[PDB]
């Protein structure tokens, strides 16, 4: 917004004082994991177990 | 930190003393006088036995542009160097006003008004009639009302008495032509019979000092009132009538200002009548003076709003008889009074009213007592010895000097700013476009030559006195037949030159047959522009080729005609490659001294010429080729820089002012007299200060105040440098984003650049607080900080009203005004930025491997006085000595806080980092005074200076070769001479001293460099073909001309037109970058002609420029020191 | 006079919040030209009674730019200027006996 | 009274809020009102025309 | 209080005004002066003399 | 200067000496005061013909 | 639409006194639009961004380009495969009340 | 208020027109009102003229 080289300034509501949104991974991306049950990996002693 | 660094070796540690000379004498310590009183300080500086500025160091009495000078004496090789300092006396940029209010308040809750009225009319019964309605009315005012803040508003009255003293003293001569007095014009501007303003007369001693009713007509002992044909004037009334008219006005003020005089100082009576004329005029707006320059007001006369008229109220009869006292006509021993003149009485008054009016310009009047600087200093002493204002004159000096003194800023005098930011935009907004049109026109016309006695018959040969332009010309000058296909310049650049200038083919190349006879070059060496040409100064076959020659080509004895000016501007720009475009042309004009731009504005506007350029050159196209310079602006006003930008004119303090402080009314002084007549208001210290103003001349006062203006401007330069006060910094405080780079402002738009934690409220308190702390340490006692607090006084900084569109690219140029050497002059060798280079050290021979930039060899981390921009500035001055440019890139990495956009680099300050240096107008003689723009960069940004890719490049022209020819005008071009017999014409325009042997010893040392590296050669050779007399055949003309050189100094025939090898390049398809020049023109361009040189880096280039930097710098340097002194006080 | 309206632009009647954002320059820029630090220094019927309330100057030149050095003077430059001014020993302390 | 330039209150932007005055919370201020913001925002708009 | 207030009034110099010698519209003016940008405005109040 | 008058004040504060909105009308081009332009606006009847 | 990002590699030469060099890396994928993946050619949600496959031991600075929001070449939502036995692929349609 | 060829286009002319010098007659008053509401779209109906 030039208007003859006249640039105004945002004095209190600029990029430095902008209210950012606290974000987690689950905010943006889908969790493809059911809370109803768990998948237990096959953990025995030997490979044949 | 995400950036990969490269390993490097440690660098040579350097300090300021490595590159820059200390201009302080180690042999002569000038001592100073003690004193901590401010009234005593005025007495110490005003002693006739001391001088602040010597009279040969002051060009004060000029129509604008008062300069004050200093000399640097080298104590080794005994060469000197003169430095100037330019002040303005135009009112175009004043912006400070002062007003005094005569507000009276009530007092004495119980004091019985009727018993004072008895004392008043009984004490004054011996002068004024006791039972009258005026003595009862004025004794009623004194008994009930006192004045609000009296005898402290005597600052304003002494402010205006000093303003008038300087107004009549900084004018070429106090004539009626130089000092008009405001008259009373009716419609159509005719005076109304005496020209005296109707309500408040000041050409008569009747409004001030009304007559006595006891001495008026009809009083017992006096004659009866005369009849109608010679009746007394209507506006003359006795004093007791005037007292009946005193009243409290709507503004709670008194009608007048009563200055009651009990006993009178014993001045010669003719000096009492003169200071009364002054006391009557100090009340009027602008001191009662008229507009004497540019139809505007003076530096001192402007901003004086005035006050109510003074009423001289004699409490005794010794002032009434002092005015009419006649002391002339007696020439006895012990009886003669020098310069005494009989009183001049207004007719039909009872010899009671003195008449001040004399003849003026037309029917206008003129008070000759106002044009005498003695009558303005007499009135100061009269008021001190009658009213006690000793402590208020010291405040009056410091307030007058700050308000009424203005410098010129770096843009005009040191920096290479274009005409857009150097000149007034309201007038010179199309001067670059129109001057480009003029040159593009003349360069593409075939200026034909008159045939043999053929009335109106012309020949296609261009006339001899107008050399053919190498690039856009028509044919070879040294051709037997110009019609030959071999002698025909290629027309590849001609039409695009006129399309660039005018547009879309509205002007075409053609013939001009208006000057086919020849130019009448004048013998008037004062006004001659033809004296500069090498061809007009031929030398014999045995004469030294370095000889200046003798000007033997004048023809007429008048002043320089119009066609002579056209020739000078024709030849000045002929060889300059900066005609390829209007954008490149304006960059050329940016490097011209301001004293040459004034001569181009006289030409561009036809100020003094008989006929306009269009009439001279037969120009008949729609677009205009001239500019409308105002009516007031003369040739002498333009030469005094009446065209400068009113924003580059900085007050001595970096602040403006609008003071309204309630002042003297005189009711408190007259009330205390009636109570007890045995006291005085004037103290014995005020009677001593009054005595010196009786015994003083304008010369003594001028140096006192032109020394204060220097002292305060050096304290403001310190404050500007400390707080980085520039247009960008002030605009940031006002809430704007001022930046020369437009994309830098778009990126800074939404961030926290503009804060409430950075405002003008705080930036002004920093400036005023720190400035008025230096001013005390310098013993100046300025009241900027005090007046800032008052409710009705406003103190503001300098750039509160700048034009954002025009001065956008000047956003980062600090507000320092005076030259880096004039700061050392005033501040005892101290410096801010950096001035003269050094010869005591070999900083130019340091060579390190695989470092690409010169100034990357040096390490300024440990230096306390030296900075990362002090080496870049030093290198730019080092290279400019050899005639070379170092292009520095400066950049602001702006990453928006909290925003994810890419961090961006913005090239800043590319108006000055892209154009070459300039011979400063402060000291235009030596190259060492050409100061780098990097020293006037300020701002609240973090920058990264770095060498541009192949930044080391030759300048447009060698500024060491250009020099002014005389002090009067700005005749400026390549100069030569300096032989065993002659001397180089190297003069300082507006200079104060004549250049002595130590100034021409500098030229002599510089001209005797090895291999003639300090001079530009001249040669006598065929350079045209004059038309043979009584035929149509052209015989070769033998012409003295220049020799075109290279970077390395080589001289080949291919660099030149007028030579077969060099003209062959022009006849082929050539561009604007071809190195072919016409040596018959006054400016020669640099280039890499037939050398293997290209654009290298600064470190490799400075090694390559061996002799042109090392040898030149050795001849331009001594151990300079200041053996002068600006700060002298008596014990 | 000159009637104003939408012309050849895709502007319609909208809400206040979306329309103030949409007309960005014609409000923020004009406010800078129109507004100021307006103050009344006069009152009829009353006189200004001054107060000592610690007039405020800005504590620091806030520098912007993420890379580089600033343009501040070298740390020993104004110190050398003060020392030179102290040598002249002209410091004024009294005005007619009054400090 | 008249408007201010001390702050960039005209640059405050928010999601889904349709009214300009609804962007500001006057509740903590004992000084200012709900018709004060609406009256101000009519003076803010009148600046732009 | 009147004694205190008689020292003041609407009419000052380049700060206030009084246009009362009219055909029925007396006004009182006052200039509001800006410090940051040197912007000044003038305000009036109109009195009905009819 | 822009003709910004005060239709009932005196030959004083704003009508004579002070400039009101000296900055809005001055430093602003596309979003400030309206622009003027010289171009063919009408046709004047030629003299001695139709 | 497409958001253009930049990975910048900066090399400093403060000991040479010449301007630093800034270089662009990973431009093959940051300058070309996202693609309907073969792993899951059914939804736009399955088109994966190249920033997740950026690896390396070099120090880059990731920042969004200036005015990087531009439309794609074609709208990848509308493209789908017609057969499971070859690669017929074009703009598709037909999810009606019956088809 | 016409302007020069290379003057500042955002200038204020010097009012070259005006032939009589007596007083603004009725026709000059009519012209001023003619141009004041000339391009006002509020002349469609009396209600919006109000």
TrEMBL record, chain D:
It comes from the Viruses. This is Coat protein. It comes from Rosellinia necatrix megabirnavirus 1 (isolate -/Japan/W779/2001). The chain holds residues 845 to 893 of 1240 of the full protein.
Automatic annotation (TrEMBL), chain E:
This is Coat protein. It comes from Rosellinia necatrix megabirnavirus 1 (isolate -/Japan/W779/2001). The chain holds residues 51 to 100 of 1240 of the full protein.
TrEMBL record, chain G:
This is Coat protein. It comes from Rosellinia necatrix megabirnavirus 1 (isolate -/Japan/W779/2001) (RnMBV1).
UniProtKB/TrEMBL annotation, chain H:
This is Coat protein. It comes from Rosellinia necatrix megabirnavirus 1 (isolate -/Japan/W779/2001) (RnMBV1).
């Amino acid at each position: 917004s030039g208007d003859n080289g006249v640039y105004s300034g945002s004095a209190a509501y600029n990029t430095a004082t902008a209210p950012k949104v606290p974000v987690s991974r689950a905010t943006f991306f889908q969790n493809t994991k059911s809370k109803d049950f768990d998948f237990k990996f096959a953990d025995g002693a030997d490979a044949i177990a | 930190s995400a950036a990969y660094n490269t390993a490097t070796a440690p660098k040579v540690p350097v300090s300021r003393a490595t590159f820059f000379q200390n201009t302080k004498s180690k042999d002569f310590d000038f001592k100073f006088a003690d004193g901590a009183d401010a009234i005593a300080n005025v007495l110490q500086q005003m002693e006739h036995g001391v001088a602040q500025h010597q009279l040969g160091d002051m060009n004060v009495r000029t129509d604008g542009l008062a300069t004050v000078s200093a000399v640097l004496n080298g104590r080794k090789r005994k060469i000197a160097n003169q430095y100037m300092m330019h002040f303005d006396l135009f009112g175009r940029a004043a912006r400070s006003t002062v007003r005094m209010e005569s507000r009276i308040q009530s007092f004495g809750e119980g004091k019985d008004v009727d018993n004072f009225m008895a004392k008043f009319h009984n004490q004054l019964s011996g002068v004024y009639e006791r039972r009258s309605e005026g003595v009862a009315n004025f004794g009623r005012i004194l008994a009930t009302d006192t004045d609000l803040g009296g005898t402290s508003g005597l600052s304003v009255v002494f402010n205006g008495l000093l303003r008038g003293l300087h107004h009549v003293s900084t004018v070429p001569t106090p004539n009626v032509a130089n000092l008009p007095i405001r008259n009373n014009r009716d419609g159509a501007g005719a005076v109304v019979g005496r020209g005296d303003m109707p309500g408040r007369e000041f050409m008569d001693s009747s409004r001030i000092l009304p007559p006595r009713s006891s001495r008026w007509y009809g009083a017992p002992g006096q004659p009866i009132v005369p009849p109608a044909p010679n009746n007394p004037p209507a506006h003359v009334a006795p004093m007791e009538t005037v007292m009946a008219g005193l009243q409290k006005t709507v503004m709670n003020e008194l009608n007048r200002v009563i200055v009651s005089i009990a006993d009178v100082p014993k001045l010669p009576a003719h000096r009492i009548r003169n200071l009364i004329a002054v006391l009557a005029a100090v009340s009027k707006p602008n001191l009662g003076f008229d507009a004497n320059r540019l139809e505007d007001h003076s530096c001192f006369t402007k901003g004086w709003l005035g006050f109510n008229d003074i009423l001289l109220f004699p409490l005794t009869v010794d002032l009434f008889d002092r005015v009419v006292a006649n002391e002339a006509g007696v020439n006895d021993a012990g009886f003669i009074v020098p310069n005494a003149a009989p009183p001049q009485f207004l007719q039909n008054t009872n010899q009671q009213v003195i008449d001040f009016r004399g003849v003026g310009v037309g029917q206008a009047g003129d008070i000759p007592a106002l044009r005498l600087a003695q009558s303005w200093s007499d009135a100061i002493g009269f008021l001190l010895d009658t009213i006690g204002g000793e402590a208020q004159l010291a405040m009056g000096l410091n307030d007058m000097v700050a308000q009424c003194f203005h410098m010129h800023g770096a843009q005009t005098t040191m920096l290479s700013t274009p005409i857009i930011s150097r000149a007034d935009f309201g007038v010179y907004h199309n001067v670059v476009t129109n001057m480009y049109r003029r040159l593009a026109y003349m360069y593409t016309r075939l200026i034909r030559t008159n045939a043999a006695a053929g009335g109106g018959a012309m020949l296609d040969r261009q006339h001899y006195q107008w050399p053919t332009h190498a690039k856009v010309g028509f044919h070879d000058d040294t051709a037997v037949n110009a019609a030959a296909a071999a002698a025909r310049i290629h027309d590849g650049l001609r039409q695009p030159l006129l399309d660039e200038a005018f547009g879309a083919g509205v002007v075409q190349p053609g013939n001009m047959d208006l000057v086919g006879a020849g130019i009448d070059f004048t013998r008037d060496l004062t006004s001659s522009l033809g004296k500069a040409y090498p061809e007009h100064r031929p030398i014999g076959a045995d004469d030294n080729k370095r000889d200046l020659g003798d000007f033997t080509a004048g023809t007429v004895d008048a002043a320089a005609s119009g066609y002579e000016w056209d020739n000078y501007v024709y030849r000045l720009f002929g060889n300059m490659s900066a005609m390829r475009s209007k954008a490149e042309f304006d960059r050329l004009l940016a490097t011209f001294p301001s004293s040459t731009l004034s001569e181009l504005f006289i030409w561009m506007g036809n100020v003094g010429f008989a006929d306009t350029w269009e009439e001279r050159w037969g120009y008949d196209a729609a677009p205009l080729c001239s500019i409308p310079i105002p009516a007031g602006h003369d040739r002498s006003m333009l030469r005094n820089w009446s065209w400068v930008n009113v924003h580059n004119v900085h007050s001595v303090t970096g602040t403006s002012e609008n003071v309204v402080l309630a002042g003297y009314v005189g009711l408190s002084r007259t009330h205390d007299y009636i109570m007890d007549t045995r006291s005085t208001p004037a103290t014995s210290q005020g009677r001593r200060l009054a005595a010196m103003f009786y015994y003083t001349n304008a010369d003594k006062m001028l140096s006192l105040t032109f020394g204060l203006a220097g002292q305060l401007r050096a304290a403001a330069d310190t404050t500007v440098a400390k707080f980085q006060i520039c247009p960008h910094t002030i605009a940031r405080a006002q809430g704007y984003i001022m930046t020369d780079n437009d994309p830098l402002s778009d990126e800074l738009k939404g961030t926290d650049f503009v804060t409430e934690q950075f405002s003008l409220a705080g930036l002004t308190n920093l400036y005023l607080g720190y400035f008025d702390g230096l001013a005390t340490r310098l013993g100046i006692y300025d009241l900027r900080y005090t007046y800032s607090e008052y409710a009705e006084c406003r103190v503001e900084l300098h750039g509160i009203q700048r034009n954002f569109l025009t001065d956008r690219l000047d956003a980062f140029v600090s507000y320092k005004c005076l030259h880096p050497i004039m700061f050392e002059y005033y501040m005892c060798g101290a410096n801010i930025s950096g001035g003269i280079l050094n010869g005591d050290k070999a900083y130019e021979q340091v060579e390190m491997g695989n470092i690409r930039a010169y100034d990357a060899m040096f390490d300024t981390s440990a230096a306390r006085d030296f900075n990362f921009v002090g080496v870049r500035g030093a290198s730019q001055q080092i290279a400019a000595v050899g005639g070379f440019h170092i292009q520095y890139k400066m950049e602001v990495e702006i990453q928006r806080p909290g925003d994810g956009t890419e961090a961006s680099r913005f090239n800043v300050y590319e108006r000055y980092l892209n154009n070459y240096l300039r011979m400063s107008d402060c000291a235009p003689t030596s190259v060492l005074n050409a100061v780098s723009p990097l020293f006037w960069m300020a701002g609240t940004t973090r920058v990264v200076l770095c060498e541009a890719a192949n930044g080391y490049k030759p300048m447009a022209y060698d500024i060491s070769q250009t020099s002014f020819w005389n002090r009067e005008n700005g005749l400026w071009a390549f100069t030569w001479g300096e032989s065993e017999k002659t001397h180089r014409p190297n003069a300082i325009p507006h200079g104060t001293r004549r250049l002595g042997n130590s100034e021409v010893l500098m030229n002599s040392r510089f001209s005797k460099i090895l291999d003639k590296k300090g001079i530009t050669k001249l040669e006598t050779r065929v350079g045209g073909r004059k038309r043979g007399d009584n035929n149509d055949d052209f015989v070769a003309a033998d012409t003295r001309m220049f020799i075109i050189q290279d970077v390395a100094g080589g001289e080949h025939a291919a660099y030149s037109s007028l030579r077969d090898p060099g003209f062959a390049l022009v006849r082929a398809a050539h561009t604007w970058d071809t190195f072919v020049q016409n040596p018959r023109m006054l400016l020669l361009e640099r280039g890499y002609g037939n050398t293997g040189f290209t654009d290298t880096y600064s470190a490799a280039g400075i090694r390559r420029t061996n002799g042109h930097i090392s040898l030149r710098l050795s001849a331009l340097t001594d151990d300079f020191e200041f053996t002068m002194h600006p700060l002298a006080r008596a014990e | 006079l000159l009637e104003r309206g939408y012309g050849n632009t895709g502007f319609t009647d909208t809400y206040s919040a979306a329309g103030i954002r949409r007309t960005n320059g014609h409000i923020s820029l004009r406010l800078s030209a129109l507004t100021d630090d307006f103050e009344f220094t006069m009152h009829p019927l009353a006189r200004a009674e001054y107060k000592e309330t610690s007039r405020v100057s800005l504590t620091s030149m806030i520098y912007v730019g993420t890379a580089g050095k600033d343009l501040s003077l070298p740390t020993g430059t104004v110190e050398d200027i003060i020392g030179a001014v102290d040598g002249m020993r002209r410091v004024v302390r009294t005005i007619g006996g009054q400090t």
